[PDB]
């Protein structure tokens, strides 16, 4: 396939996210190996999994324009705490 890196707008709620990351350093095998984070979990619901364009097996490559290529669950967990219900998720995948 194609590594398509893709903005993500949820509309989610006033707490927020409610959503967990992995931090998993992917070793790639091409050699570039990107940011390892991973999505751990997802509320429940909320409008996140209830959207559907975003998945909990996928990765978050650029969060509120943040760009977190290369950091650690410790970052990627304080973004994804950061966010409000409008959040442009620029996750890439195939």
């Given at each position: 396939?194609?590594?398509?890196?893709?903005p993500?707008?949820?509309?989610?709620?006033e707490?927020?996210?409610?959503?967990?990351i992995?931090?998993?350093g992917?070793?790639a095998?091409?050699?570039?190996?990107?940011?390892?984070i991973?999505?751990?979990?997802?509320?429940?619901?909320?409008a996140?999994?209830?959207?559907?364009?975003?998945?909990?097996?996928d990765?978050?490559?650029?969060?509120?324009?943040?760009?977190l290529?290369g950091?650690?669950q410790?970052?990627?967990?304080?973004?994804?705490?950061n966010?409000?219900g409008?959040?442009?998720?620029?996750?890439?995948?195939e």
């Open positions: 396939g194609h590594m398509e890196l893709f993500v707008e949820l509309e989610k709620d707490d927020g996210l409610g959503i967990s992995i931090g998993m992917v070793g095998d091409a050699g570039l190996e990107k940011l390892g991973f999505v751990k979990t997802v509320t429940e619901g909320g996140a999994q209830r959207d559907g364009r975003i998945q909990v097996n990765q978050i490559v650029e969060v509120d324009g943040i760009s290529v950091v650690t410790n970052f990627a967990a304080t973004v994804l705490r966010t409000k409008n959040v442009r998720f620029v996750i890439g995948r």
